[PDB]
């Protein structure tokens, strides 16, 4: 039970993929080991 993004799996502290904007790989551990930007995914307004 739970169809939202409130505690997916403690994955909010990625470091930084080297590719960055030029990253065209699709791996399961890559999306969780290295991020591709620097923005939050939940606190962007606070009301």
**What is the rounded distance in angstroms from the CA atom of residue 12 to the CA atom of residue 23?**
20
CB of 44 vs Zn ion, minimal distance in Å? 23
11, 16, 23, 41: residue in contact with Zn ion (rule CB under 5 A): 23
25 is in an annotated binding site: yes
User: Does 31 interact with Zn ion (rule: CB under 5 A)?
Assistant: no
φ, ψ (nearest 5 deg) of residue 22: -100, 50
Residue pair 35/16 in contact (Cβ under 8 Å)? The answer is yes
Binding residues, as ranges, are: 19, 24-25
- Which parts of this chain interact with Zn ion (CB under 5 A)? 17, 19, 23
């Amino acid at each position: 039970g739970g169809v939202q993004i409130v505690g997916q799996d403690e994955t909010d502290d990625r470091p930084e993929c080297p590719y960055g904007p030029s990253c065209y790989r699709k791996n399961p551990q890559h999306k969780i080991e290295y991020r591709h930007n620097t923005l939050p995914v939940r606190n962007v307004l606070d009301e």
